[PDB]
Amino acid sequence: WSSHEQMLAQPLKDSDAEVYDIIKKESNRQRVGLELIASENFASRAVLEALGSCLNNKYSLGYPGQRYYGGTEHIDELETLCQKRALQAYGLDPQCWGVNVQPYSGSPANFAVYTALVEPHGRIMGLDLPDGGHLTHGFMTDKKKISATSIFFESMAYKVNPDTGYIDYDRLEENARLFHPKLIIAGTSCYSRNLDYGRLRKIADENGAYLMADMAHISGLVVAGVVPSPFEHCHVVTTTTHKTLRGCRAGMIFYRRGVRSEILYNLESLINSAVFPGLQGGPHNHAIAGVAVALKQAMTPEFKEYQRQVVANCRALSAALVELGYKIVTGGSDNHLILVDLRSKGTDGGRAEKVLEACSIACNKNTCPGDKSALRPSGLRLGTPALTSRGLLEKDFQKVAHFIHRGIELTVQIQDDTGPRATLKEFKEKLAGDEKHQRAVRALRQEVESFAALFPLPGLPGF
Amino acid sequence: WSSHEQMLAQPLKDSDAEVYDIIKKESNRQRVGLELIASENFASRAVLEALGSCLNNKYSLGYPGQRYYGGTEHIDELETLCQKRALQAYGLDPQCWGVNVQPYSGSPANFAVYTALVEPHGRIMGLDLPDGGHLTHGFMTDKKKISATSIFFESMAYKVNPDTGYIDYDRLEENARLFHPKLIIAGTSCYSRNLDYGRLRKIADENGAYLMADMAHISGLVVAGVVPSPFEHCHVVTTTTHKTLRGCRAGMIFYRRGVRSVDKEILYNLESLINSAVFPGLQGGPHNHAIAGVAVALKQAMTPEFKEYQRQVVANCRALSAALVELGYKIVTGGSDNHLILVDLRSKGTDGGRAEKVLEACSIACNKNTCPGDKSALRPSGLRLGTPALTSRGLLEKDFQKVAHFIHRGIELTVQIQDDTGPRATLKEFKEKLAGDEKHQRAVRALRQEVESFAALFPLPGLPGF
Amino acid sequence: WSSHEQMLAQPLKDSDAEVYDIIKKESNRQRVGLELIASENFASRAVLEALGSCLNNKYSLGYPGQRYYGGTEHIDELETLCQKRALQAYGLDPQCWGVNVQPYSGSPANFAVYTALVEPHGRIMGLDLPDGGHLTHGFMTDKKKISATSIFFESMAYKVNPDTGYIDYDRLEENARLFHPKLIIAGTSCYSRNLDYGRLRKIADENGAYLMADMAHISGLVVAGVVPSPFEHCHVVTTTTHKTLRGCRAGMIFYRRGVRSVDKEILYNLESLINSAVFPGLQGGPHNHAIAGVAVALKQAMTPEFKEYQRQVVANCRALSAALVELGYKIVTGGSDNHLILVDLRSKGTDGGRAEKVLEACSIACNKNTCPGDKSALRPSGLRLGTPALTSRGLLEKDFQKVAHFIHRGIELTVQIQDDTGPRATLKEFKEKLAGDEKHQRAVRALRQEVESFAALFPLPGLPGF
Amino acid sequence: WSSHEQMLAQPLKDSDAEVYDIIKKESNRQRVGLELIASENFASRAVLEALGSCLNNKYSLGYPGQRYYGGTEHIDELETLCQKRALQAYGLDPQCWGVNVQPYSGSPANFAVYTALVEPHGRIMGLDLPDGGHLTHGFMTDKKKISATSIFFESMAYKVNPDTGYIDYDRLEENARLFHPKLIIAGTSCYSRNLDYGRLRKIADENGAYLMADMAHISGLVVAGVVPSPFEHCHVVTTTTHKTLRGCRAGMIFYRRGVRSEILYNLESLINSAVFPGLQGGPHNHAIAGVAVALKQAMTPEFKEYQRQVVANCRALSAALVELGYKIVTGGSDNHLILVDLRSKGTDGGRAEKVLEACSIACNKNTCPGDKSALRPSGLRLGTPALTSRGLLEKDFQKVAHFIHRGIELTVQIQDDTGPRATLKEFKEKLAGDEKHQRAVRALRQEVESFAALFPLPGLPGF
Ligand SMILES: *Cc1c(COP(=O)(O)O)cnc(C)c1O
Ligand SMILES: *Cc1c(COP(=O)(O)O)cnc(C)c1O
Ligand SMILES: *[C@H](*)c1c(COP(=O)(O)O)cnc(C)c1O
Numbered sequence A, D: 001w002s003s004h005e006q007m008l009a010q011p012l013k014d015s016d017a018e019v020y021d022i023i024k025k026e027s028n029r030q031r032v033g034l035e036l037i038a039s040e041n042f043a044s045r046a047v048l049e050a051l052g053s054c055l056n057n058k059y060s061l062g063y064p065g066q067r068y069y070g071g072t073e074h075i076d077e078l079e080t081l082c083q084k085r086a087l088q089a090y091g092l093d094p095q096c097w098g099v100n101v102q103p104y105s106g107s108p109a110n111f112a113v114y115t116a117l118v119e120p121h122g123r124i125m126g127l128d129l130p131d132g133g134h135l136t137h138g139f140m141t142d143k144k145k146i147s148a149t150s151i152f153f154e155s156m157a158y159k160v161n162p163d164t165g166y167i168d169y170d171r172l173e174e175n176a177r178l179f180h181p182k183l184i185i186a187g188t189s190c191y192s193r194n195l196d197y198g199r200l201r202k203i204a205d206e207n208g209a210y211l212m213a214d215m216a217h218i219s220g221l222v223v224a225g226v227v228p229s230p231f232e233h234c235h236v237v238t239t240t241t242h243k244t245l246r247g248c249r250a251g252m253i254f255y256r257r258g259v260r261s262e263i264l265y266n267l268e269s270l271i272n273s274a275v276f277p278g279l280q281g282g283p284h285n286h287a288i289a290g291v292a293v294a295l296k297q298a299m300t301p302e303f304k305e306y307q308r309q310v311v312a313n314c315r316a317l318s319a320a321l322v323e324l325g326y327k328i329v330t331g332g333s334d335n336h337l338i339l340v341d342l343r344s345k346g347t348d349g350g351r352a353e354k355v356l357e358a359c360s361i362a363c364n365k366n367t368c369p370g371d372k373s374a375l376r377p378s379g380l381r382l383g384t385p386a387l388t389s390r391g392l393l394e395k396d397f398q399k400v401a402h403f404i405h406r407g408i409e410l411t412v413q414i415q416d417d418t419g420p421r422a423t424l425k426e427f428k429e430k431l432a433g434d435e436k437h438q439r440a441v442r443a444l445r446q447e448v449e450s451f452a453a454l455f456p457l458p459g460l461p462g463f
Numbered sequence B, C: 001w002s003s004h005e006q007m008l009a010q011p012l013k014d015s016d017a018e019v020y021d022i023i024k025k026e027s028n029r030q031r032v033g034l035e036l037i038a039s040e041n042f043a044s045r046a047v048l049e050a051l052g053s054c055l056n057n058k059y060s061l062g063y064p065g066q067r068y069y070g071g072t073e074h075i076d077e078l079e080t081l082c083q084k085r086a087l088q089a090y091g092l093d094p095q096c097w098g099v100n101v102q103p104y105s106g107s108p109a110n111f112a113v114y115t116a117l118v119e120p121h122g123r124i125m126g127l128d129l130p131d132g133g134h135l136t137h138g139f140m141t142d143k144k145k146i147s148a149t150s151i152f153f154e155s156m157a158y159k160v161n162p163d164t165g166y167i168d169y170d171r172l173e174e175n176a177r178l179f180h181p182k183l184i185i186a187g188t189s190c191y192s193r194n195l196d197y198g199r200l201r202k203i204a205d206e207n208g209a210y211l212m213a214d215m216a217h218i219s220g221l222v223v224a225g226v227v228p229s230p231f232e233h234c235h236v237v238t239t240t241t242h243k244t245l246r247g248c249r250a251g252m253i254f255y256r257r258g259v260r261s262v263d264k265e266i267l268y269n270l271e272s273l274i275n276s277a278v279f280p281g282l283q284g285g286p287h288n289h290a291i292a293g294v295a296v297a298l299k300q301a302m303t304p305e306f307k308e309y310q311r312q313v314v315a316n317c318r319a320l321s322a323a324l325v326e327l328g329y330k331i332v333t334g335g336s337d338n339h340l341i342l343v344d345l346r347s348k349g350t351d352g353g354r355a356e357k358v359l360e361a362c363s364i365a366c367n368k369n370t371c372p373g374d375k376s377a378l379r380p381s382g383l384r385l386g387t388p389a390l391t392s393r394g395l396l397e398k399d400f401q402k403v404a405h406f407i408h409r410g411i412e413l414t415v416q417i418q419d420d421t422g423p424r425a426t427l428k429e430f431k432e433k434l435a436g437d438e439k440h441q442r443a444v445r446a447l448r449q450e451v452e453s454f455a456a457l458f459p460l461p462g463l464p465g466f
């Protein structure tokens, strides 16, 4: 047809006004808000351009040199290039390390590794969820298995010491001798400290287990050399490509090659087989191009500088909050985030996140090591990656600290009008249903959005 | 250091010349070639524009109803809109059907359903791979379990009758009574005929099993009303959004809501089990930019232009099959009801394994596939051919007849090379003969030229030559 | 307190009058009844004497080779002797066959083999229960797994052809290619014909599976050479020691040793895997008194008298079947090659469910069983009849013809009662009609008298009326 | 035939001379030896008579009131009677407790319970093997699963404190919150102390798990009221019928009936279904008769007296050994056995058991809580049930203590001639290959066998 020939060439603005409008409103919402959620960032224009390329059309099952279909000359150049930049970015010798770049995301990357090295019902140990662990590391209760990791495998968590906020390696070492894990996971979603990879490797070798690092949250810090690298002691390293690496959504699996002890590593073929034809079908080539572009950007001195600023910003933010009387779990941080214990102010993350949200300050609740209840998490997780990508510096994060402080005070107030004992649903009602309050929110929001508009919003020119 | 901000705003062309160059060469490769691989298509510009939006930066966990974090006012509008268009596009009453739009792709969508309704080691039955089934429907040998479906669940396949090329429903009905499946899969990767959903539903109900349709390959034909809908008898329907639906890569899970049976009645519990399996079960944050792309593709799929596109797709397949029959080729089941056909090359004394390589060198893309008969997977007898991609470029019946002759020229050439390599020669040797033999290499070059010239006559959908 | 020692030396008759009385009544019940249940027999006095020996007090763990504790000089002589007699009795070369004699019973013997060669969730194929298979070969429905074999492993049955009553090897061969079993079971609980071990071995080798024979029902016939031996084609053979072997309750596992295949050759690893599964895998200390009983039964089974007993067993079954055919009864497969027959009572308008109850009240023991046809398990059409027990009491062909008429009288009576209860009457009601109805109760009493008088004419093997 | 008619009536002595001879030699070996293996005993004549009855011929699938075959009038009387005596013997109200008497032995009884309440891959926790646990409670290494319990289910052990020799309940309570067991096992094969059932029940209820007691070793002590009963806090109790109960080999499963909390107990049908048709076929009726006879004997005042003597004998034996300078794990015992730590004499159980065996003194090696190696167990497990059934009293066990002591000295000697460092195979050679030694053995053996012949050997008149 003559009209069908152009339906395929019509711009989004004309083709789908409704979706186009939603993107515009979301673009604007991101501009006037303060993003403190530790897992978010702003991808560069170049990365986003690669996502909408014609690579979306190429279907290519398999791997370079092992393709099911033909016509993959350029797709091979792409994937090969992506793998080369991944090893390079982390300073890895291709004779000792290899990498798979097809995982659709972080969760799928972890699952493929378990499938490959652990097998159904094999034992896996990971940091407990309320102590800062991730769902894919295992999540189950006494009556039900929630995470797919816990459903298809046998997981058992290890905890942090509630008095220090640090991972209790001694207890882990002891429990591992009884549990007999086939794989131990070193990775976190809400832990402000570096992990003792060396100690974990010793514990893993003691039980004949593999040591897998999930560096999703610190992958960017690692490339820049701002926090120790897990590649020195781990057998496998998984990671997402967004978060601190600042790329598009996707995942990667790094695995050791060569001699293990003369015993040789068999990780490569097991992992590759698990990703495909095991768990996935055709790879998302447009996403692989986006990652390639993100990895090149991550190797620039500018990126290195960005990462140093990220950590500096976190330090300034934590210091400013301590000065305002806030308690930081473990007293501080070594990376991009901090867990703030709000008990030091008589409130909780559950109520605080809602008030701050209404004020255009995004962050999320999280349980603190102590916490005797998950229905009333004591802390707030705060991260600096996103705002640092917008150019905020130390002086800016001190102002951010005051805005957050204003928020906490407000959440406390809506709490003093409700009485020391009241449900979360009563609190939210008194929040949006009170002259002085919905009015307190409106005022703080205005100051927050004005301050936020002073900074550039990375991405495509203008949606 | 100051150039860090100038780094996040820099265009791809300046930021990464190497990747930019690869995209250009791939864009050009797609333009001068003839795409006959049944699972490929060309996504519209609008869809691709949605993929590179700022939706990439939004991390949301959970569903529109209950999210983990805040600031999802617009993400909720998006996902909700996407779900509404999905039900609408397939003519489904939201009181009887619901839909999850977060699966990252087709394989993940199927796996989430198994995880939800079957549970570890539960029994699943699907069409055998060499008979046209998909990996995610189960794949194992007597010594090893390859597909994740076969590793975490207990799968057993059902076959097609090798004499008719059709699915043997009688044998399936019998074997199901002994196997006791908890779920039966109705879906194919290389089957040219409609599926008897009604018959499969009866067999499923007989064993108390769920009937799941994987309509990935025909999802576009279904929307246009060109082939019967699986929503009439199935409990669950999974699908990819690319392939015939012509969207970006992603997956969707449709499930029934309301009353299942009586006596006094019992309700469907598919919704919460499936939603829980997708998240927090198997996935983390949804890819919102991909959900926007799907939304855009679903709106385009409801237009009369799309419906006309789908009619042309089937008409093209019919013309292509007729033209090949006229040239003496054997088509499994003798023909097709949809977008593809499986060509049995034994009728010409060669096989798909060698033919696909020669055709590839001539810029004609397609893939080998075993035929129902075939007593060996190392020497598949057929070639799977699809019309979706080329129809999106505007080819009509007369164009597919010309395509048929180009393919025929290719087969003749591969036969010439096969006779030159020997009898017990290996594919490895066949490919080397095709690579370093000026004689054949000259035949290839000539045919390639004609194929690429003919292909340049048609527009390549997408962005402005990117 | 001083009478404690006088307590450990006191005879059962004085020590426990109540138990002693029960044994007396049971001994008498066995004497005046006609035992036609195919799985029963009467163990010799010698065997029973070994069971009550001081071997009961010896706790030994491990095997003759390597034990956990000491003081096993004689226990080693015993187990070693038992293994030697087992191989000998079946004419097996110890260089090609080995045997484990610790299983506590038949079910445990099978389970240990599955545990050793299959592993959790491994695939196993066995004869379907309603077609004559045993529980330990797999038993599950579409909603629940009943047998431990079906709970810990993945089982799928194969069936007999309902028109011929024979095992459909063709369908099994086909289904095995799709199911991929790791082990196939050749053994039955209610099948009157010989098994085609050769054919099953070919099918097993085709799928790389092990072939395991469960010869529990025919172990005695095999020793005597009255039916073909499964040791010619199987990799493993399990069996109970009671039933036709006429020993005490226990089980044994025979496994091949040496070279399995070539190319350069590979060895059998069955021995250590099986031994490890029995102990320390599934069992603790072996029952030595039971191992002594088996040893004694194996020596008796190698005598010419035993061989003659086994020939009489088969001849009796043939006469019993012929006599029933003459009375108009239908026998599945038309006859038998061994010790039993499945009688299809549809040929008389009744079913095994009601017939077994009436016959029981007349002191004629047998059990119901579904026939290949049967469209319902709640109304089994047949009766399984065996001759081992009565042949051990000396009945000959002319005696089994009289037995046939008594059974016939029973069937006529159950038909009379069925017509009196109604059409859609329940078994519950059928049993109540048979219980509180002087008319039928008078018919029962009369037939019972004739049956018990005829049965008292024969000796009851075992101890002196105990 | 006329000769076949009598092959079945011929006595064992004439029918099978070879087997008959073996029984005679074994009967004699039992008479002249000193049985100190804690799991052995001598069954009464009455019990043995029931085993060789005509009950061996009756095939009866199912349970009373639920039979597959007919002609079970007396078999029903038997099983019913056996169940009634089992409940009675332990003072259980049939409205609150039920019992299955078909398990062929102890291991099968445990396995059926796991099959019924845990299901494939369900989690189970039991006392670690080297700390006194039993195989059926779980046994696996970092590379292989040995016990069927560990192969079909997911097991993890709990340990004893190596400094006190007692079960560390605190650590168990902590690990259970991470492991999430569906069932916890309270039972031992080599533990001289009573178990804190109350504490274990609290831990089980805390994780929603079932508490199962395996009282195999103390079932006789329990009936007599010499050690606390596990029926006060457990949901299920399994046991063998030999060992201290002094019956034939068989097993039983006791389970609670009635209201659990209005939630009702579902143990009965699950357990019955698992035993049959789940795991077993026809029950061994002759063994059920033997158990019935053993249960009646266990309820007599004479049996009660026997059990008091058993414990008194153990106390005297332990005191006499302490006086000779031997170390007893946990310092003593509350029951029929003791674990002797031979490190206090510079030798190990591995070597000592062999020397004592050569001297006609039966016992077995066992690791001590400390032990940094299973290939060189430090202790010897000694039990008094068997010898007490032969009439030994306190004064007799003091003499037994000296004989054992003489044995230890000899094992040490063969050890001083071999040098502080030598393999177990060299030691055994120097034992049987030395004039003074094989001569030392012969002498002690003579004294041991003479002393042993002074006591009656329970059982059948004379084989
Ligand atoms: C966020 C996060 C994930 C989830 O990533 P997805 O790409 O959303 O699937 C996985 N692992 C860790 C350690 C994380 O922080
Ligand atoms: C000895 C013992 C067993 C083993 O009994 P078997 O009857 O040999 O199978 C099981 N459990 C415990 C606690 C034991 O002491
Ligand atoms: C292609 C295809 C798939 C796989 O989809 P992916 O999106 O590539 O992961 C699944 N099912 C069917 C029926 C297909 O044709």
Ligand SMILES: *[C@H](*)c1c(COP(=O)(O)O)cnc(C)c1O
Pocket: C039, C105, C106, C107, C108, C134, C136, C187, C188, C189, C214, C215, C216, C217, C240, C249, C250, D280, D281, D282
């Ligand atoms: C009877 C029978 C069994 C069961 O034996 P048990 O000793 O009763 O436990 C197993 N297999 C077959 C083939 C049988 O006939």
